[PDB]
């Protein structure tokens, strides 16, 4: 199984600057890079040659951190604050996917929609429903993208139509990790608490001892919100910081671990975040429609912490991660400017690294053309925005900035194409 | 002149909330509005009617600040701030239409995008040029949509390749005036300085001079770079703010006078803004791009400063004022966030009403679909984005944040549609 691509190419092998490649060639086989260069090599002249003309071949968007379950509220109801925001729109929405019905149709719309924004691998909170986040695991699988799929454990303070029994919650979470765990290639579990104030010591226990047993990574929330976080130290009292709770039951890095936003995170849970090797996912959409604040990311980078990107949907108002790409720059821009020009903002290469290889890295060997990486790309067709008066990167940063998904032409997970 | 348009009405006629009006009729007769009802009178039951069933029918965008000759700078070079941002990109871009067919060629592009994305009415900056400037009023005239036009004076502090002496610029500039201030009735001049640091006391003057001969509104720049401000400052060592400098030569406020940014604005220039009933063009795109600054926009409406929103082309991203809307929106959640939620952000409604009734205003009876007003409209058909599960205001606001230039089916300007 052999398949030659040819097109102009730009990818991030760091975080300091695009490598950009005119007309050039990238052979794949089983789904893995084999060969990245300007001239075809021998060895492989007589296959066919998919040429891509003077579009653009991109690795493909690798989105950390996003409810499935909230797809409906996209663009809606973004007028509170985190708590009670989930009290008047999410939660109730999370609950009809009780029904399996509404989940198939809600998540097929979700998939269609990653899918033609670009996105090729995810990390996803589904719901508390065992049935439907089965479903979501089947659908996903269908698709051809890949991701971690996350049931939603929550027993603790949630409202009487959308809470489970920590006993349930533990054998529907492994449950479905007996049946995935060995399934797909692509598509796998992830320990999945809600965070911290929807979870009880017994639940997170049980989760922490899934997570060891099965070798799982997880994922969940941190310091997103002032009123989340002193809610978090007032039902635990004995902590000095919000992810001091996780690594408690060991769910903070014991595995690769996955924090959402991670806006007000104190010194010492940076500190913990940066030792126990905890991957920060930085939401920068969602940050600004719920009012949460704005992450400090260069302070988190020169730390060496690992800084991933999420669209965190619902809350965050858009799927396309190029979108989010342009918005954590400009985040970081504004936090350049209140710090007297001292912490610099993101260049175009650093944010569109989050997107790509350093995200894609959580999957595996994605995110970026080297030999021995799977094949996760987007073709850009750009015609419609005076292509030819840019150069390569100035096309990329253009289409970022002023493109969609009409210019995105094709997709790609492993070799494959995905419709 | 009758025409008779149909469909699912949304507007504001306050800026705290939307009226709405399903399946109703807009008639219009020689370009403004007739009547709007529910239902339509029998003295019209033999004239066709144009039928947008369900469709969305929105009055036009009305962006208050755009620089027209900076079109092809969109999504590039925006890794600095105002003051190096202008000497290394903008005036280097600006210098090229000393060339009437490269201006030709670019605003043709510009105007076509405007069009496109919804802008009904505009604000623009050209450059110091005034043959280009010329075309650019010929252009704007042929397209048919509404606009302020500002050749730019500066004189002062500015590159060789692009300064030009007081008196040239004061002379071109009744030229412009004379040639302009009867021809077009929706096509019309305004005085524009760039902005103090590159204009000259005599060139302020002069201009102070014209705005008060003609009756001509003004536009310039006020507060929206600390190094900027500094520089206003060190040039005017008796001033006691930014604002007051524009004030000494009659630019603020004796005509309705347009002032981009105000984002560091002093308690006294705030008040003499207030006072001298000066507009404020809320930019936030832009304030994120070159790292300015965020504007607090609740404090200045707590005051009951007139604010429009301008895409500020080339620094902001984008010429729709949609994606504008949502930034506007998204910064004031930040600044209520901040202020210990004490200043409520944006509701859709508020912002929708500065880029529509407000906006508009500042053209004349334009924003609204009352008695009276010119018919300024945008047909939206949001097919692909299941109307059919969202009410009215749900679809509109889902339209600003995950909609785009694809939704927009039709555009009218005074009641003519344009293509
Ligand atoms: N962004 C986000 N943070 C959360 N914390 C708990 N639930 C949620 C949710 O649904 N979205
Ligand atoms: N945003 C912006 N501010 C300015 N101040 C002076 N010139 C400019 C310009 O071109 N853009
Ligand atoms: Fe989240
Ligand atoms: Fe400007």
């Given at each position: ?7 102009n ?6 975080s ?8 050039s060639?990238?052979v ?13 090599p021998?060895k492989?002249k ?21 409810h ?13 604050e ?11 929405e999370?609950?009809k996917?009780?029904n399996?019905?509404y ?18 691998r ?7 429903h ?5 479903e979501?695991?089947?659908?996903l699988?269908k698709?051809?993208?890949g ?17 489970e029994?920590?006993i349930?919650?533990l ?22 608490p ?7 010591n ?10 060891y ?10 310091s997103e919100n ?5 809610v978090?130290?007032?039902?635990h ?6 992810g ?14 996955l ?26 959409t969602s ?10 990311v260069?302070?988190?980078?020169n ?22 790409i ?8 504004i ?5 007297g ?9 650093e ?6 290889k ?8 994605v995110?970026s ?7 996760d ?5 750009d ?6 008066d840019?150069?390569l990167?100035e096309?990329l ?8 998904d ?8 492993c070799?494959?194409?995905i419709?």
């Amino acid at each position: 199984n052999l398949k030659i691509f040819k097109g102009n190419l730009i990818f991030t092998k760091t975080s300091d600057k695009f490598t950009i490649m005119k007309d050039s060639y990238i052979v794949v086989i089983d789904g893995k890079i084999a060969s990245v260069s300007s001239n075809l090599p021998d060895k492989y002249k007589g296959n066919p040659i998919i040429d891509f003309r003077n579009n653009i071949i991109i690795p493909g968007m690798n989105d950390l951190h996003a409810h499935a379950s909230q797809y409906k509220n996209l663009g809606i109801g973004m007028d509170k604050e985190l708590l009670p925001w989930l009290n008047n729109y999410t939660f109730p929405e999370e609950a009809k996917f009780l029904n399996v019905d509404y989940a198939k149709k809600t998540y097929g719309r979700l998939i269609k929609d990653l899918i033609k924004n670009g996105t090729t691998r995810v990390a996803l909170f589904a719901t508390l429903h065992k049935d439907s986040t089965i479903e979501l695991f089947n659908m996903l699988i269908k698709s051809g993208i890949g991701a971690y799929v996350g049931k939603v454990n929550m027993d603790y303070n949630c409202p009487d139509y959308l809470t489970e029994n920590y006993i349930t919650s533990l054998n529907d979470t492994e449950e479905i990790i007996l049946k995935y765990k060995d399934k797909s290639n692509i598509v796998k579990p992830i320990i999945t608490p809600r965070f911290v104030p929807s979870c009880s010591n017994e639940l997170m226990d049980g989760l922490g001892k899934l997570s060891y047993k099965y070798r799982l990574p997880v994922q969940s929330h941190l310091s997103e919100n002032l009123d989340e976080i002193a809610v978090v130290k007032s039902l635990h009292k004995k902590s000095n910081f919000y992810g001091e709770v996780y690594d408690k039951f060991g769910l903070f890095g014991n595995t690769p671990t996955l924090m959402a936003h991670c806006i007000h995170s104190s010194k010492e849970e940076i500190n913990l975040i940066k030792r126990n090797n905890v991957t920060i996912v930085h939401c920068p959409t969602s940050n600004f429609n719920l009012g949460s604040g704005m992450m400090p990311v260069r302070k988190y980078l020169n730390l060496g912490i690992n800084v991933v990107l999420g669209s965190d949907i619902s809350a965050g108002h858009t799927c396309s991660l190029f979108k989010v790409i342009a918005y954590a720059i400009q985040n970081s821009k504004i936090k350049w400017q209140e710090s007297g020009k001292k912490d610099m903002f993101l260049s175009t290469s650093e944010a569109f690294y989050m997107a790509t290889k350093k995200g894609g890295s959580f999957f595996g060997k994605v995110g970026s053309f080297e030999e021995g990486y799977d094949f996760d790309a987007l073709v850009i067709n750009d015609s419609n925005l005076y292509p030819e008066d840019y150069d390569l990167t100035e096309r990329l940063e253009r289409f970022i900035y002023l493109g969609d998904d009409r210019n995105i032409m094709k997709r790609y997970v492993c070799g494959n194409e995905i419709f």
